[PDB]
């Protein structure tokens, strides 16, 4: 089932322990592997004591739809994973943010949903968890230890985030109009005006493919195609010590910019390696992360490298004929 990128699932020994601010793209990935980022989100926003993801890690998180394709690739980054790396922000839920029906919000402490204008998260505090509907957090004595399993987390939709190639606004307007033409029925998506209607049905579930292009709102699609290109970058690689764990920034920088470390074939054909010296010792090894590559989508005659792309459930209001 998926598997960790670098670091196995955590076994946390104290719920009051702190969440350190590590600086390397490997230490960050390791914290992602162990759901340290989602636990931090809980501590800040929902005033929550402890860690979520004990012994499970990111790989044991629950998805909706549960048959989640991207999950099978450990390298593909969920909206929370991009949050921990700075690529985007998952906002704290407000009253207006509509909780979509269909997922199994029961016992969940955290769940995350891509919205039409961004990414939103709902949390529960200490000793509480979500009721069947997801509208309320209520006392849950099975959440009392503060060292909670990974299935308490719910990531909605088959989403995968990456480094975009920025697009000019003229391209965004082209792509925004084409989506409007393709979904003329829709009035609002997640409260954001999409078409001009003057008569709107009540909010309704909406399953749609979308893409984050780095502008105000996502662009939803019906007819699109995808292609998983392999484009080498530094973030294609994580560097690790086989027993110490993730390496430090200065070490990993020395690996990726100085050809001083070791690693698998693709890394050596990017940065540089060496062998025939290691007697017993220990030196950082760098390996390729497990993903098909960077995703490129074709839509409206144009071809874009998005920040995030996936098929999730948003809330849309339709026309009243």
């Amino acid at each position: 089932d998926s598997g960790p990128i670098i670091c196995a699932g955590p076994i946390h020994s104290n719920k009051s322990a702190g969440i350190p601010h590590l600086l390397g793209y490997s230490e960050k990935i390791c914290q992602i592997d162990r759901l340290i980022h989602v636990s931090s989100w809980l501590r800040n926003h929902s005033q929550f004591q402890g860690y979520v993801g004990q012994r499970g890690g990111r790989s044991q998180v629950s998805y909706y739809p549960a048959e989640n394709s991207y999950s099978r690739w450990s390298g593909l980054l969920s909206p929370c994973d991009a949050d921990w790396l700075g690529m985007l922000v998952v906002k704290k839920a407000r009253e207006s943010d509509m909780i979509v029906p269909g997922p199994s919000y029961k016992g969940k402490v955290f769940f995350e949903r891509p919205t039409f204008d961004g990414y939103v998260g709902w949390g529960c505090g200490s000793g509480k968890s979500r009721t069947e509907s997801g509208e309320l957090c209520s006392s849950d004595s099975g959440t009392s230890s503060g060292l909670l399993p990974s299935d308490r987390v719910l990531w909605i939709g088959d989403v995968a985030c990456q480094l975009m190639t920025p697009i000019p606004e003229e391209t965004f307007l082209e792509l925004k109009s084409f989506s409007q033409s393709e979904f003329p029925d829709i009035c609002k998506i997640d409260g954001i005006v999409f078409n001009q209607c003057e008569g709107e049905s009540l909010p309704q579930p909406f399953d749609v493919a979308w893409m984050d292009v780095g502008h105000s709102h996502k662009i939803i699609m019906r007819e699109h195609k995808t292609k998983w290109v392999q484009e080498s970058s530094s973030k294609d690689f994580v560097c690790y010590k086989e027993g110490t764990g993730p390496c430090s920034e200065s070490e990993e920088k020395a690996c990726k910019t100085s050809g001083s470390c070791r690693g698998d074939m693709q890394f050596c054909k990017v940065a540089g390696c060496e062998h025939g010296e290691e007697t017993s010792e220990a030196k950082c090894r760098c390996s390729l992360v497990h993903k098909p590559g960077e995703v490129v989508v074709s839509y409206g005659g144009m071809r874009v490298r998005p920040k995030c792309y996936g098929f999730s459930r948003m809330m849309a209001t339709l026309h009243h004929h």
Partner: T-cell receptor
Amino acid sequence: QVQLVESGGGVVQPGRSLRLSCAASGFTFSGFGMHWVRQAPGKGLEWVALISYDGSDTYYSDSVKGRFTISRDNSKNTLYLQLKSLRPDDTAVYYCVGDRDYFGSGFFDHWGQ
Amino acid sequence: DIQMTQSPSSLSASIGDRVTITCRASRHITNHLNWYQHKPGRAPKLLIYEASNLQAGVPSRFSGSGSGTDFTFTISSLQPEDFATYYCQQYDNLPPAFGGGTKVDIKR
């Protein structure tokens, strides 16, 4: 505040079945994994079994696997260990143990008598 | 699976001395190790978790260190109550394992 009151011990003969119970007070029992650790005369400690907060996850040592069954009623705040097919190797003192996380990961924090 | 080995089996030391028990794990368990004090009649007591952390309410003379396979438990200044048997326990693999132990006697 956090106490564990064991009961059920006695004199049973080889091939008989005893039942042990561990009443837990002072903490939210349903949110913590529990253990059973035993110590035979003249020997060291030996972990026996563990149960998760839900009861959904159980784990046993090799020396007792298939004979001893660990269970918990989280509505009465008591932990159980069901002994079967008992043997002279099992002659020991049986301690119940409270853990720190949802599962019984192996932090033997608060014991019984 | 994982078989812990402690050394020495026994150790005699007088009050005020430094007592350094060592524990060894057949495989790498990172820092998933605990240390326990057991005295005759009374139940075991948890001193160190994660191989270096002090349990709440335990004197600062007790310590712990190590990661990987080789670990250490040290009493900086022995006290009369500190005479008991001590155990190390791994929790990296789901079957938890106690080492053999180490009894602490008093030099006379």
